[PDB]
Design a protein around this motif. Structure first.
Motif, PDB file in Angstrom:
ATOM      1  N   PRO A 115     138.151  11.370  97.815  1.00 34.25           N
ATOM      2  CA  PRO A 115     138.145  12.749  98.085  1.00 34.25           C
ATOM      3  C   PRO A 115     136.694  13.499  98.565  1.00 34.25           C
ATOM      4  O   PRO A 115     136.843  14.360  99.063  1.00 34.25           O
ATOM      5  N   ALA A 116     136.003  13.035  98.627  1.00 32.85           N
ATOM      6  CA  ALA A 116     134.553  13.076  99.369  1.00 32.85           C
ATOM      7  C   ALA A 116     134.069  12.728 100.432  1.00 32.85           C
ATOM      8  O   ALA A 116     134.973  11.937 101.416  1.00 32.85           O
ATOM      9  N   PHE A 117     133.647  14.321 101.209  1.00 35.90           N
ATOM     10  CA  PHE A 117     133.596  14.344 102.842  1.00 35.90           C
ATOM     11  C   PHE A 117     134.961  14.332 103.612  1.00 35.90           C
ATOM     12  O   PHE A 117     134.463  13.231 104.454  1.00 35.90           O
ATOM     13  N   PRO A 118     135.924  14.651 103.423  1.00 32.39           N
ATOM     14  CA  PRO A 118     137.406  14.644 104.265  1.00 32.39           C
ATOM     15  C   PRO A 118     136.943  14.759 106.152  1.00 32.39           C
ATOM     16  O   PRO A 118     136.003  15.711 106.410  1.00 32.39           O
ATOM     17  N   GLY A 119     138.074  14.673 107.030  1.00 27.03           N
ATOM     18  CA  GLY A 119     137.814  14.697 108.141  1.00 27.03           C
ATOM     19  C   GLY A 119     136.368  14.631 108.658  1.00 27.03           C
ATOM     20  O   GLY A 119     136.531  13.405 108.817  1.00 27.03           O
ATOM     21  N   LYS A 120     136.154  14.762 110.456  1.00 26.69           N
ATOM     22  CA  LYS A 120     135.540  14.114 111.060  1.00 26.69           C
ATOM     23  C   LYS A 120     134.300  13.697 110.830  1.00 26.69           C
ATOM     24  O   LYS A 120     132.938  14.443 110.185  1.00 26.69           O
ATOM     25  N   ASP A 121     133.425  12.977 111.640  1.00 24.41           N
ATOM     26  CA  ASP A 121     132.622  12.779 111.997  1.00 24.41           C
ATOM     27  C   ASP A 121     131.755  12.112 110.169  1.00 24.41           C
ATOM     28  O   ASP A 121     130.973  13.079 109.733  1.00 24.41           O
ATOM     29  N   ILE A 123     130.424  10.225 108.202  1.00 25.73           N
ATOM     30  CA  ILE A 123     129.452   8.784 108.225  1.00 25.73           C
ATOM     31  C   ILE A 123     127.952   9.842 108.383  1.00 25.73           C
ATOM     32  O   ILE A 123     127.295  10.195 107.850  1.00 25.73           O
ATOM     33  N   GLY A 124     128.563  10.862 109.169  1.00 26.86           N
ATOM     34  CA  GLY A 124     127.353  12.132 109.199  1.00 26.86           C
ATOM     35  C   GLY A 124     127.574  13.119 107.914  1.00 26.86           C
ATOM     36  O   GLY A 124     126.175  13.286 107.878  1.00 26.86           O
ATOM     37  N   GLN A 125     128.789  13.207 108.266  1.00 28.64           N
ATOM     38  CA  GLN A 125     128.835  14.198 106.645  1.00 28.64           C
ATOM     39  C   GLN A 125     127.846  14.224 105.350  1.00 28.64           C
ATOM     40  O   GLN A 125     126.743  14.397 105.069  1.00 28.64           O
ATOM     41  N   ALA A 126     127.808  12.633 105.407  1.00 32.72           N
ATOM     42  CA  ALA A 126     127.192  12.151 104.298  1.00 32.72           C
ATOM     43  C   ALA A 126     125.653  11.823 104.403  1.00 32.72           C
ATOM     44  O   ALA A 126     125.462  12.220 103.522  1.00 32.72           O
ATOM     45  N   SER A 132     123.447   9.991  97.961  1.00 32.24           N
ATOM     46  CA  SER A 132     122.829   8.662  97.213  1.00 32.24           C
ATOM     47  C   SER A 132     123.812   7.543  97.960  1.00 32.24           C
ATOM     48  O   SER A 132     123.182   6.035  97.835  1.00 32.24           O
ATOM     49  N   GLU A 133     124.932   7.986  98.242  1.00 26.41           N
ATOM     50  CA  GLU A 133     125.865   6.703  98.316  1.00 26.41           C
ATOM     51  C   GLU A 133     127.040   7.093  98.693  1.00 26.41           C
ATOM     52  O   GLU A 133     127.684   8.688  98.791  1.00 26.41           O
ATOM     53  N   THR A 134     128.016   6.399  99.637  1.00 25.83           N
ATOM     54  CA  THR A 134     128.721   6.847 100.374  1.00 25.83           C
ATOM     55  C   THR A 134     130.564   5.709 100.335  1.00 25.83           C
ATOM     56  O   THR A 134     129.596   4.397  99.658  1.00 25.83           O
ATOM     57  N   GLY A 135     130.988   5.671 101.588  1.00 22.91           N
ATOM     58  CA  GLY A 135     131.366   4.456 101.137  1.00 22.91           C
ATOM     59  C   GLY A 135     133.017   4.538 102.368  1.00 22.91           C
ATOM     60  O   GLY A 135     133.220   5.061 103.242  1.00 22.91           O
ATOM     61  N   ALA A 166     121.058   2.196 110.827  1.00 25.22           N
ATOM     62  CA  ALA A 166     121.763   1.435 109.276  1.00 25.22           C
ATOM     63  C   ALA A 166     122.934   1.620 108.848  1.00 25.22           C
ATOM     64  O   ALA A 166     123.814   0.821 108.196  1.00 25.22           O
ATOM     65  N   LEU A 167     123.272   3.395 108.462  1.00 23.72           N
ATOM     66  CA  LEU A 167     124.117   3.210 107.362  1.00 23.72           C
ATOM     67  C   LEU A 167     125.455   3.316 108.277  1.00 23.72           C
ATOM     68  O   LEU A 167     126.600   2.069 107.757  1.00 23.72           O
TER      69      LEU A 167
END
Ligand SMILES: [Mg+2]
Ligand SMILES: [Mg+2]
Length: 188
Positions: A115-121, A123-126, A132-135, A166-167
């Motif tokens: 449930p982390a960073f739902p919604g648009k963009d 990648i940009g949000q994280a 330090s990490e996302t997925g 890079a991400l």
């Protein structure tokens, strides 16, 4: 009876390509039967044509409401005996018309560890949050936005100092691997 899949996409179509490539090499026990695209001119349309995948292309501007165009999409889906729907770069929310007809049969790939960073963009949000990490997450689509049950996830580190480019490349690479793998198991 092999399951028939419709892929909804609005852009470049790289995820669509990954799914088509997997089926082509014999790693996807399902038929990529249709591309639904809400943006005429999108590159994914050209991909479908090259890959001999039927496409239903429409412009939301030719309809008075989301219900209006989803009603036509639904008729098209049923007439083409579509069983599952995979959102892959579809840039708008699926409405009740489709959610009701394909409840539990709609999946989506999202560039964050829901449930982390739902919604648009996401990648940009994280990136902007400084974490330090996302997925990448493949999940079921339900009434909520990016809230349906998680099906599979892959952790992606965010390296300190590296540009967002890079991400993004790392995340896209993961999406191209993960989506076909998840669809293989879901539709097999
Ligand atoms: Mg092989
Ligand atoms: Mg028409």
């Amino acid at each position: 009876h092999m399951k028939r899949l419709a892929v909804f996409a609005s852009g470049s179509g790289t995820n669509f390509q990954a799914i088509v490539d997997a089926a082509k090499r014999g790693d996807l026990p399902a038929r990529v039967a249709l591309l639904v695209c809400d943006r005429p001119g999108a590159k994914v349309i050209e991909r479908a044509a090259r890959e001999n995948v039927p496409a239903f292309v429409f412009s939301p501007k030719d309809y008075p409401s989301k219900a209006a165009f989803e009603s036509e999409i639904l008729r098209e889906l049923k007439g083409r005996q579509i069983d599952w729907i995979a959102l892959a770069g579809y840039m708008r929310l699926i409405g009740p018309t489709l959610l009701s007809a394909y409840e539990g049969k709609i999946v989506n790939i999202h560039p964050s560890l829901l449930p982390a960073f739902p919604g648009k963009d996401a990648i940009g949000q994280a990136y902007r949050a400084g974490v330090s990490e996302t997925g990448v997450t493949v999940h079921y689509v339900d009434e909520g936005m990016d809230t349906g049950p998680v099906i599979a996830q892959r952790v992606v580190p965010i390296v300190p100092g590296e540009p967002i480019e890079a991400l993004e490349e790392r995340i896209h690479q993961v999406e191209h691997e993960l989506y076909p793998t998840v669809l293989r198991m879901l539709l097999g």
